[PDB]
Amino acid sequence: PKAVIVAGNGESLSQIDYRLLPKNYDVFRCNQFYFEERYFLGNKIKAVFFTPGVFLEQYYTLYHLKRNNEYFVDNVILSSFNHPTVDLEKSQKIQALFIDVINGYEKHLSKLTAFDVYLRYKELYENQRITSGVYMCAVAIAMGYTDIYLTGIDFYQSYHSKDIDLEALSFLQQHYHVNFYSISPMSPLSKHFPIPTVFVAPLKENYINDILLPPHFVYEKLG
> How near is the Cβ of 158 to its own copies at its closest, in Å?
12
- Residue of 17, 70, 106, 116 interacting with its own copies (CB under 8 A): 116
Burial 25-53 (b: 16+ CB within 10 A, else e): bbbbbbbebbebeeebbeeebbbbbbebe
Catalytic residue among 121, 159, 175, 219: 159
Q: Is 159 labeled as catalytic in the residue annotation?
A: yes
Angle at 114 between CA 53 and CA 196, to 5 degrees: 80
- Residue of 1, 53, 202, 214 interacting with its own copies (CB under 8 A): 214
> How near is the Cβ of 215 to its own copies at its closest, in Å?
8
Assign 99 to helix, strand or coil: coil
In 3D space, the residue among 187, 91, 178 whose CA is nearest the CA of residue 143 turns out to be: 178
CA distance 64 to 78: 19
Asked whether position 174 contacts its own copies by CB under 8 A, the answer is no
Assign 95 to helix, strand or coil: helix
Region of 8-16, 20-28, 35-43, 209-217 interacting with its own copies (CB under 8 A): 209-217
Count Cβ atoms within 10 A of the Cβ of residue 190 and give its class: 0-12 exposed, 13-18 middle, 19 or more buried: middle
C-beta closer to its own copies: residue 15 or 82:
82
Asked whether position 158 contacts its own copies by CB under 8 A, the answer is no
List active site positions.
Answer: 129, 156, 159-160
* Interacting residues toward its own copies by CB under 8 A: 60, 63, 83-85, 88, 96-100, 113, 116-117, 120-121, 124-125, 127, 214-215, 217-218, 221-222
